Amino acid sequence: GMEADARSIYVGNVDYGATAEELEAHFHGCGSVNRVTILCDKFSGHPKGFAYIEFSDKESVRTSLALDESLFRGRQIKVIPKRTNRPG
Amino acid sequence: GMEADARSIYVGNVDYGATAEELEAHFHGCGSVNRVTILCDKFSGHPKGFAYIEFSDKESVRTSLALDESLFRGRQIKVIPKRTNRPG
């Protein structure tokens, strides 16, 4: 829901070989993670997918923003709050 | 939405090392896959997570039911229609 979403980030430029363990490991230093959701629309060739990371605390979202443009599995990831293009 | 959900299955007993490519490969014979969603609540130790597979055609859901109790990454998976515990 909206409260879980307020504690979540969108992570762009994720590939079809990414695992939840790898993603949690990348964001571990930002704080405790409740849930990792990976959404893939391509399963071979050029990838097409993203993830949501739901943190336990809201302050971890702000912290995680420093990981925008960081290298994850050899690709620069995009990190924004999950509710960015949503009212509030 | 409800129409995407009607073309989707829930897959239980998925672990934090599962990839979308592996999951699509397991269900490939059932028909074309639109999207794989992996949802993990544990990232080490005993796993806790599941997935949704959204097929291109609704008939692929029925076909995929034969994969209930099949071995995926060394574990017996649970396959049910995504809207099972939902009205319709």
mmCIF file with all atom_site columns, C-alpha atoms in Angstrom:
data_model
loop_
_atom_site.group_PDB
_atom_site.id
_atom_site.type_symbol
_atom_site.label_atom_id
_atom_site.label_alt_id
_atom_site.label_comp_id
_atom_site.label_asym_id
_atom_site.label_entity_id
_atom_site.label_seq_id
_atom_site.pdbx_PDB_ins_code
_atom_site.Cartn_x
_atom_site.Cartn_y
_atom_site.Cartn_z
_atom_site.occupancy
_atom_site.B_iso_or_equiv
_atom_site.pdbx_formal_charge
_atom_site.auth_seq_id
_atom_site.auth_comp_id
_atom_site.auth_asym_id
_atom_site.auth_atom_id
_atom_site.pdbx_PDB_model_num
ATOM 1   C CA . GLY A 1 1  ? 0.000   0.000   0.000   1.00 0.00 ? 1  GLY A CA 1
ATOM 2   C CA . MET A 1 2  ? 0.781   3.721   0.033   1.00 0.00 ? 2  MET A CA 1
ATOM 3   C CA . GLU A 1 3  ? 2.706   3.389   3.349   1.00 0.00 ? 3  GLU A CA 1
ATOM 4   C CA . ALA A 1 4  ? 4.834   0.430   2.035   1.00 0.00 ? 4  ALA A CA 1
ATOM 5   C CA . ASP A 1 5  ? 5.344   2.507   -1.164  1.00 0.00 ? 5  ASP A CA 1
ATOM 6   C CA . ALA A 1 6  ? 6.572   5.532   0.898   1.00 0.00 ? 6  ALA A CA 1
ATOM 7   C CA . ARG A 1 7  ? 9.293   3.188   2.279   1.00 0.00 ? 7  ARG A CA 1
ATOM 8   C CA . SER A 1 8  ? 10.180  1.914   -1.232  1.00 0.00 ? 8  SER A CA 1
ATOM 9   C CA . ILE A 1 9  ? 12.449  2.804   -4.109  1.00 0.00 ? 9  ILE A CA 1
ATOM 10  C CA . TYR A 1 10 ? 12.204  2.075   -7.815  1.00 0.00 ? 10 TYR A CA 1
ATOM 11  C CA . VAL A 1 11 ? 15.454  0.640   -9.253  1.00 0.00 ? 11 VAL A CA 1
ATOM 12  C CA . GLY A 1 12 ? 15.804  0.884   -13.059 1.00 0.00 ? 12 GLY A CA 1
ATOM 13  C CA . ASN A 1 13 ? 18.144  -0.864  -15.519 1.00 0.00 ? 13 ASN A CA 1
ATOM 14  C CA . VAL A 1 14 ? 17.891  -4.321  -13.907 1.00 0.00 ? 14 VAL A CA 1
ATOM 15  C CA . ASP A 1 15 ? 18.469  -7.455  -16.096 1.00 0.00 ? 15 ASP A CA 1
ATOM 16  C CA . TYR A 1 16 ? 16.766  -10.848 -16.263 1.00 0.00 ? 16 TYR A CA 1
ATOM 17  C CA . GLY A 1 17 ? 19.676  -12.534 -14.379 1.00 0.00 ? 17 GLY A CA 1
ATOM 18  C CA . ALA A 1 18 ? 19.323  -10.307 -11.252 1.00 0.00 ? 18 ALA A CA 1
ATOM 19  C CA . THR A 1 19 ? 18.374  -12.098 -7.974  1.00 0.00 ? 19 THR A CA 1
ATOM 20  C CA . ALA A 1 20 ? 16.648  -10.685 -4.845  1.00 0.00 ? 20 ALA A CA 1
ATOM 21  C CA . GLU A 1 21 ? 19.707  -11.687 -2.782  1.00 0.00 ? 21 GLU A CA 1
ATOM 22  C CA . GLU A 1 22 ? 21.996  -9.582  -5.110  1.00 0.00 ? 22 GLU A CA 1
ATOM 23  C CA . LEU A 1 23 ? 19.675  -6.617  -4.958  1.00 0.00 ? 23 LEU A CA 1
ATOM 24  C CA . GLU A 1 24 ? 19.327  -6.746  -1.164  1.00 0.00 ? 24 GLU A CA 1
ATOM 25  C CA . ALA A 1 25 ? 23.149  -7.070  -0.911  1.00 0.00 ? 25 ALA A CA 1
ATOM 26  C CA . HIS A 1 26 ? 23.531  -3.864  -3.046  1.00 0.00 ? 26 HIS A CA 1
ATOM 27  C CA . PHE A 1 27 ? 21.161  -1.872  -0.778  1.00 0.00 ? 27 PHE A CA 1
ATOM 28  C CA . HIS A 1 28 ? 22.073  -3.519  2.549   1.00 0.00 ? 28 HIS A CA 1
ATOM 29  C CA . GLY A 1 29 ? 24.079  -0.595  3.835   1.00 0.00 ? 29 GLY A CA 1
ATOM 30  C CA . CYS A 1 30 ? 21.032  1.729   3.399   1.00 0.00 ? 30 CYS A CA 1
ATOM 31  C CA . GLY A 1 31 ? 19.106  -0.144  6.094   1.00 0.00 ? 31 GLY A CA 1
ATOM 32  C CA . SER A 1 32 ? 16.959  -3.244  6.706   1.00 0.00 ? 32 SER A CA 1
ATOM 33  C CA . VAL A 1 33 ? 14.998  -4.436  3.618   1.00 0.00 ? 33 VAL A CA 1
ATOM 34  C CA . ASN A 1 34 ? 11.454  -5.867  3.945   1.00 0.00 ? 34 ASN A CA 1
ATOM 35  C CA . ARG A 1 35 ? 10.797  -6.979  0.405   1.00 0.00 ? 35 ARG A CA 1
ATOM 36  C CA . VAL A 1 36 ? 12.460  -7.078  -3.003  1.00 0.00 ? 36 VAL A CA 1
ATOM 37  C CA . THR A 1 37 ? 10.212  -7.183  -6.092  1.00 0.00 ? 37 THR A CA 1
ATOM 38  C CA . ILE A 1 38 ? 11.781  -7.809  -9.501  1.00 0.00 ? 38 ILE A CA 1
ATOM 39  C CA . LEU A 1 39 ? 9.657   -7.137  -12.603 1.00 0.00 ? 39 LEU A CA 1
ATOM 40  C CA . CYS A 1 40 ? 11.061  -8.386  -15.979 1.00 0.00 ? 40 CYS A CA 1
ATOM 41  C CA . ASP A 1 41 ? 9.493   -7.930  -19.397 1.00 0.00 ? 41 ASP A CA 1
ATOM 42  C CA . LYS A 1 42 ? 12.399  -9.501  -21.387 1.00 0.00 ? 42 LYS A CA 1
ATOM 43  C CA . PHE A 1 43 ? 14.091  -12.853 -20.591 1.00 0.00 ? 43 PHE A CA 1
ATOM 44  C CA . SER A 1 44 ? 16.865  -12.944 -23.236 1.00 0.00 ? 44 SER A CA 1
ATOM 45  C CA . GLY A 1 45 ? 18.681  -10.524 -25.550 1.00 0.00 ? 45 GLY A CA 1
ATOM 46  C CA . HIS A 1 46 ? 18.581  -6.891  -24.509 1.00 0.00 ? 46 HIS A CA 1
ATOM 47  C CA . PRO A 1 47 ? 17.057  -6.729  -21.032 1.00 0.00 ? 47 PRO A CA 1
ATOM 48  C CA . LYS A 1 48 ? 13.917  -4.825  -19.983 1.00 0.00 ? 48 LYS A CA 1
ATOM 49  C CA . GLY A 1 49 ? 13.040  -4.711  -16.293 1.00 0.00 ? 49 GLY A CA 1
ATOM 50  C CA . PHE A 1 50 ? 13.141  -2.997  -12.946 1.00 0.00 ? 50 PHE A CA 1
ATOM 51  C CA . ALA A 1 51 ? 12.759  -3.646  -9.217  1.00 0.00 ? 51 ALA A CA 1
ATOM 52  C CA . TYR A 1 52 ? 11.184  -2.230  -6.068  1.00 0.00 ? 52 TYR A CA 1
ATOM 53  C CA . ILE A 1 53 ? 13.000  -2.348  -2.752  1.00 0.00 ? 53 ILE A CA 1
ATOM 54  C CA . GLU A 1 54 ? 10.795  -1.888  0.275   1.00 0.00 ? 54 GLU A CA 1
ATOM 55  C CA . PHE A 1 55 ? 12.793  -0.803  3.303   1.00 0.00 ? 55 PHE A CA 1
ATOM 56  C CA . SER A 1 56 ? 11.749  -1.283  6.941   1.00 0.00 ? 56 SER A CA 1
ATOM 57  C CA . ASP A 1 57 ? 12.185  2.465   7.692   1.00 0.00 ? 57 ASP A CA 1
ATOM 58  C CA . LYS A 1 58 ? 11.344  5.476   5.533   1.00 0.00 ? 58 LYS A CA 1
ATOM 59  C CA . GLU A 1 59 ? 14.767  7.189   6.242   1.00 0.00 ? 59 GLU A CA 1
ATOM 60  C CA . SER A 1 60 ? 16.470  4.341   4.297   1.00 0.00 ? 60 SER A CA 1
ATOM 61  C CA . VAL A 1 61 ? 14.814  5.647   1.053   1.00 0.00 ? 61 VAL A CA 1
ATOM 62  C CA . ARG A 1 62 ? 16.633  9.003   1.299   1.00 0.00 ? 62 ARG A CA 1
ATOM 63  C CA . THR A 1 63 ? 19.903  7.174   2.160   1.00 0.00 ? 63 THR A CA 1
ATOM 64  C CA . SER A 1 64 ? 19.515  4.853   -0.904  1.00 0.00 ? 64 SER A CA 1
ATOM 65  C CA . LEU A 1 65 ? 19.233  7.808   -3.319  1.00 0.00 ? 65 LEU A CA 1
ATOM 66  C CA . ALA A 1 66 ? 23.068  8.041   -3.109  1.00 0.00 ? 66 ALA A CA 1
ATOM 67  C CA . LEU A 1 67 ? 23.066  4.664   -5.039  1.00 0.00 ? 67 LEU A CA 1
ATOM 68  C CA . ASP A 1 68 ? 21.513  6.247   -8.140  1.00 0.00 ? 68 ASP A CA 1
ATOM 69  C CA . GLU A 1 69 ? 23.983  5.700   -11.068 1.00 0.00 ? 69 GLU A CA 1
ATOM 70  C CA . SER A 1 70 ? 25.909  3.086   -9.051  1.00 0.00 ? 70 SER A CA 1
ATOM 71  C CA . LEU A 1 71 ? 27.072  -0.050  -10.900 1.00 0.00 ? 71 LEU A CA 1
ATOM 72  C CA . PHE A 1 72 ? 24.919  -3.129  -10.231 1.00 0.00 ? 72 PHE A CA 1
ATOM 73  C CA . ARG A 1 73 ? 25.774  -6.262  -12.224 1.00 0.00 ? 73 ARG A CA 1
ATOM 74  C CA . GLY A 1 74 ? 27.909  -4.118  -14.572 1.00 0.00 ? 74 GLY A CA 1
ATOM 75  C CA . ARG A 1 75 ? 25.115  -1.604  -15.333 1.00 0.00 ? 75 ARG A CA 1
ATOM 76  C CA . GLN A 1 76 ? 24.413  1.880   -13.982 1.00 0.00 ? 76 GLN A CA 1
ATOM 77  C CA . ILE A 1 77 ? 21.153  1.688   -12.064 1.00 0.00 ? 77 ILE A CA 1
ATOM 78  C CA . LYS A 1 78 ? 18.537  4.432   -11.708 1.00 0.00 ? 78 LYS A CA 1
ATOM 79  C CA . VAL A 1 79 ? 17.300  4.961   -8.076  1.00 0.00 ? 79 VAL A CA 1
ATOM 80  C CA . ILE A 1 80 ? 14.175  7.093   -7.374  1.00 0.00 ? 80 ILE A CA 1
ATOM 81  C CA . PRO A 1 81 ? 11.458  6.954   -4.645  1.00 0.00 ? 81 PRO A CA 1
ATOM 82  C CA . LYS A 1 82 ? 8.699   4.521   -5.788  1.00 0.00 ? 82 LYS A CA 1
ATOM 83  C CA . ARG A 1 83 ? 5.902   7.118   -5.498  1.00 0.00 ? 83 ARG A CA 1
ATOM 84  C CA . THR A 1 84 ? 7.940   9.815   -7.492  1.00 0.00 ? 84 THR A CA 1
ATOM 85  C CA . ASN A 1 85 ? 5.329   10.128  -10.337 1.00 0.00 ? 85 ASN A CA 1
ATOM 86  C CA . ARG A 1 86 ? 2.364   9.824   -7.838  1.00 0.00 ? 86 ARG A CA 1
ATOM 87  C CA . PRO A 1 87 ? 0.628   12.654  -5.740  1.00 0.00 ? 87 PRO A CA 1
ATOM 88  C CA . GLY A 1 88 ? 2.415   13.240  -2.331  1.00 0.00 ? 88 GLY A CA 1
ATOM 89  C CA . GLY B 1 1  ? -5.039  -5.358  -13.787 1.00 0.00 ? 1  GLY B CA 1
ATOM 90  C CA . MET B 1 2  ? -7.761  -8.001  -13.530 1.00 0.00 ? 2  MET B CA 1
ATOM 91  C CA . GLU B 1 3  ? -7.262  -9.016  -17.208 1.00 0.00 ? 3  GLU B CA 1
ATOM 92  C CA . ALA B 1 4  ? -3.427  -9.370  -16.786 1.00 0.00 ? 4  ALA B CA 1
ATOM 93  C CA . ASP B 1 5  ? -4.186  -11.309 -13.550 1.00 0.00 ? 5  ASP B CA 1
ATOM 94  C CA . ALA B 1 6  ? -6.558  -13.699 -15.441 1.00 0.00 ? 6  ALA B CA 1
ATOM 95  C CA . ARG B 1 7  ? -3.543  -14.541 -17.680 1.00 0.00 ? 7  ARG B CA 1
ATOM 96  C CA . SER B 1 8  ? -1.246  -15.037 -14.645 1.00 0.00 ? 8  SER B CA 1
ATOM 97  C CA . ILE B 1 9  ? -0.202  -17.767 -12.263 1.00 0.00 ? 9  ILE B CA 1
ATOM 98  C CA . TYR B 1 10 ? 1.116   -17.635 -8.717  1.00 0.00 ? 10 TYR B CA 1
ATOM 99  C CA . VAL B 1 11 ? 4.271   -19.759 -8.238  1.00 0.00 ? 11 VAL B CA 1
ATOM 100 C CA . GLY B 1 12 ? 5.098   -20.657 -4.608  1.00 0.00 ? 12 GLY B CA 1
ATOM 101 C CA . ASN B 1 13 ? 8.286   -21.981 -2.975  1.00 0.00 ? 13 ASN B CA 1
ATOM 102 C CA . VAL B 1 14 ? 10.683  -19.715 -4.907  1.00 0.00 ? 14 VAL B CA 1
ATOM 103 C CA . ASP B 1 15 ? 14.082  -18.791 -3.313  1.00 0.00 ? 15 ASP B CA 1
ATOM 104 C CA . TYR B 1 16 ? 16.097  -15.571 -3.193  1.00 0.00 ? 16 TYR B CA 1
ATOM 105 C CA . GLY B 1 17 ? 18.542  -16.861 -5.878  1.00 0.00 ? 17 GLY B CA 1
ATOM 106 C CA . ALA B 1 18 ? 15.804  -17.370 -8.542  1.00 0.00 ? 18 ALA B CA 1
ATOM 107 C CA . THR B 1 19 ? 16.085  -15.209 -11.721 1.00 0.00 ? 19 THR B CA 1
ATOM 108 C CA . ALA B 1 20 ? 13.336  -14.134 -14.180 1.00 0.00 ? 20 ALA B CA 1
ATOM 109 C CA . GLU B 1 21 ? 15.245  -15.893 -16.987 1.00 0.00 ? 21 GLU B CA 1
ATOM 110 C CA . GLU B 1 22 ? 15.161  -19.223 -14.988 1.00 0.00 ? 22 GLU B CA 1
ATOM 111 C CA . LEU B 1 23 ? 11.485  -18.857 -14.243 1.00 0.00 ? 23 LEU B CA 1
ATOM 112 C CA . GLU B 1 24 ? 10.565  -18.023 -17.848 1.00 0.00 ? 24 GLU B CA 1
ATOM 113 C CA . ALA B 1 25 ? 12.699  -21.009 -18.991 1.00 0.00 ? 25 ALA B CA 1
ATOM 114 C CA . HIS B 1 26 ? 10.695  -23.312 -16.614 1.00 0.00 ? 26 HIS B CA 1
ATOM 115 C CA . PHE B 1 27 ? 7.331   -22.118 -18.024 1.00 0.00 ? 27 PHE B CA 1
ATOM 116 C CA . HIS B 1 28 ? 8.417   -21.582 -21.650 1.00 0.00 ? 28 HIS B CA 1
ATOM 117 C CA . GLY B 1 29 ? 6.695   -24.663 -22.979 1.00 0.00 ? 29 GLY B CA 1
ATOM 118 C CA . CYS B 1 30 ? 3.321   -23.420 -21.582 1.00 0.00 ? 30 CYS B CA 1
ATOM 119 C CA . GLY B 1 31 ? 3.312   -20.471 -23.987 1.00 0.00 ? 31 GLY B CA 1
ATOM 120 C CA . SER B 1 32 ? 4.683   -16.941 -24.484 1.00 0.00 ? 32 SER B CA 1
ATOM 121 C CA . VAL B 1 33 ? 5.387   -15.050 -21.208 1.00 0.00 ? 33 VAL B CA 1
ATOM 122 C CA . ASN B 1 34 ? 4.728   -11.283 -20.906 1.00 0.00 ? 34 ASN B CA 1
ATOM 123 C CA . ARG B 1 35 ? 6.121   -10.581 -17.476 1.00 0.00 ? 35 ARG B CA 1
ATOM 124 C CA . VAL B 1 36 ? 7.806   -12.342 -14.569 1.00 0.00 ? 36 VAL B CA 1
ATOM 125 C CA . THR B 1 37 ? 7.457   -10.794 -11.091 1.00 0.00 ? 37 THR B CA 1
ATOM 126 C CA . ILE B 1 38 ? 9.534   -12.194 -8.228  1.00 0.00 ? 38 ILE B CA 1
ATOM 127 C CA . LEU B 1 39 ? 8.603   -11.169 -4.669  1.00 0.00 ? 39 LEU B CA 1
ATOM 128 C CA . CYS B 1 40 ? 11.110  -12.092 -1.877  1.00 0.00 ? 40 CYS B CA 1
ATOM 129 C CA . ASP B 1 41 ? 10.710  -11.455 1.835   1.00 0.00 ? 41 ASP B CA 1
ATOM 130 C CA . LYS B 1 42 ? 13.929  -13.287 2.909   1.00 0.00 ? 42 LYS B CA 1
ATOM 131 C CA . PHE B 1 43 ? 17.399  -12.804 1.340   1.00 0.00 ? 43 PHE B CA 1
ATOM 132 C CA . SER B 1 44 ? 19.463  -15.401 3.261   1.00 0.00 ? 44 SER B CA 1
ATOM 133 C CA . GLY B 1 45 ? 18.875  -18.503 5.392   1.00 0.00 ? 45 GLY B CA 1
ATOM 134 C CA . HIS B 1 46 ? 15.558  -20.237 4.862   1.00 0.00 ? 46 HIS B CA 1
ATOM 135 C CA . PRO B 1 47 ? 13.875  -18.617 1.865   1.00 0.00 ? 47 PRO B CA 1
ATOM 136 C CA . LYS B 1 48 ? 10.473  -16.886 1.794   1.00 0.00 ? 48 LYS B CA 1
ATOM 137 C CA . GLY B 1 49 ? 9.107   -15.754 -1.560  1.00 0.00 ? 49 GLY B CA 1
ATOM 138 C CA . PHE B 1 50 ? 6.974   -16.339 -4.603  1.00 0.00 ? 50 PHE B CA 1
ATOM 139 C CA . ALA B 1 51 ? 6.487   -15.207 -8.203  1.00 0.00 ? 51 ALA B CA 1
ATOM 140 C CA . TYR B 1 52 ? 3.805   -14.258 -10.714 1.00 0.00 ? 52 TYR B CA 1
ATOM 141 C CA . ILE B 1 53 ? 4.071   -15.296 -14.342 1.00 0.00 ? 53 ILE B CA 1
ATOM 142 C CA . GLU B 1 54 ? 1.899   -13.324 -16.714 1.00 0.00 ? 54 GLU B CA 1
ATOM 143 C CA . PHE B 1 55 ? 1.317   -15.196 -19.954 1.00 0.00 ? 55 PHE B CA 1
ATOM 144 C CA . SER B 1 56 ? 0.375   -13.613 -23.295 1.00 0.00 ? 56 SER B CA 1
ATOM 145 C CA . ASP B 1 57 ? -2.703  -15.892 -23.651 1.00 0.00 ? 57 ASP B CA 1
ATOM 146 C CA . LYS B 1 58 ? -5.154  -17.074 -21.000 1.00 0.00 ? 58 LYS B CA 1
ATOM 147 C CA . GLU B 1 59 ? -5.024  -20.761 -22.241 1.00 0.00 ? 59 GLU B CA 1
ATOM 148 C CA . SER B 1 60 ? -1.354  -20.899 -21.099 1.00 0.00 ? 60 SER B CA 1
ATOM 149 C CA . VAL B 1 61 ? -2.547  -20.622 -17.428 1.00 0.00 ? 61 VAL B CA 1
ATOM 150 C CA . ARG B 1 62 ? -4.490  -23.909 -17.656 1.00 0.00 ? 62 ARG B CA 1
ATOM 151 C CA . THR B 1 63 ? -1.513  -25.551 -19.452 1.00 0.00 ? 63 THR B CA 1
ATOM 152 C CA . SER B 1 64 ? 0.917   -24.365 -16.693 1.00 0.00 ? 64 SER B CA 1
ATOM 153 C CA . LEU B 1 65 ? -1.148  -26.016 -13.926 1.00 0.00 ? 65 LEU B CA 1
ATOM 154 C CA . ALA B 1 66 ? 0.537   -29.316 -14.962 1.00 0.00 ? 66 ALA B CA 1
ATOM 155 C CA . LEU B 1 67 ? 3.789   -27.745 -13.519 1.00 0.00 ? 67 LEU B CA 1
ATOM 156 C CA . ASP B 1 68 ? 2.384   -27.684 -9.975  1.00 0.00 ? 68 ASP B CA 1
ATOM 157 C CA . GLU B 1 69 ? 4.740   -29.819 -7.769  1.00 0.00 ? 69 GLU B CA 1
ATOM 158 C CA . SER B 1 70 ? 7.437   -29.774 -10.477 1.00 0.00 ? 70 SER B CA 1
ATOM 159 C CA . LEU B 1 71 ? 11.054  -29.294 -9.343  1.00 0.00 ? 71 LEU B CA 1
ATOM 160 C CA . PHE B 1 72 ? 12.394  -25.763 -9.890  1.00 0.00 ? 72 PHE B CA 1
ATOM 161 C CA . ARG B 1 73 ? 15.886  -25.046 -8.548  1.00 0.00 ? 73 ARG B CA 1
ATOM 162 C CA . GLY B 1 74 ? 15.697  -28.270 -6.491  1.00 0.00 ? 74 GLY B CA 1
ATOM 163 C CA . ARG B 1 75 ? 12.364  -27.381 -4.814  1.00 0.00 ? 75 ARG B CA 1
ATOM 164 C CA . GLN B 1 76 ? 8.800   -28.494 -5.526  1.00 0.00 ? 76 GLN B CA 1
ATOM 165 C CA . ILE B 1 77 ? 6.891   -25.429 -6.671  1.00 0.00 ? 77 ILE B CA 1
ATOM 166 C CA . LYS B 1 78 ? 3.206   -24.673 -6.084  1.00 0.00 ? 78 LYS B CA 1
ATOM 167 C CA . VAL B 1 79 ? 1.326   -23.470 -9.250  1.00 0.00 ? 79 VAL B CA 1
ATOM 168 C CA . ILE B 1 80 ? -2.182  -21.916 -8.961  1.00 0.00 ? 80 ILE B CA 1
ATOM 169 C CA . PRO B 1 81 ? -4.044  -19.232 -11.004 1.00 0.00 ? 81 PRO B CA 1
ATOM 170 C CA . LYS B 1 82 ? -3.142  -15.767 -9.584  1.00 0.00 ? 82 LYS B CA 1
ATOM 171 C CA . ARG B 1 83 ? -6.781  -14.788 -8.911  1.00 0.00 ? 83 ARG B CA 1
ATOM 172 C CA . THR B 1 84 ? -7.561  -18.184 -7.106  1.00 0.00 ? 84 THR B CA 1
ATOM 173 C CA . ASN B 1 85 ? -8.495  -16.528 -3.730  1.00 0.00 ? 85 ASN B CA 1
ATOM 174 C CA . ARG B 1 86 ? -10.292 -13.577 -5.517  1.00 0.00 ? 86 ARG B CA 1
ATOM 175 C CA . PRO B 1 87 ? -13.999 -13.383 -6.801  1.00 0.00 ? 87 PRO B CA 1
ATOM 176 C CA . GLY B 1 88 ? -14.356 -14.764 -10.424 1.00 0.00 ? 88 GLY B CA 1
#
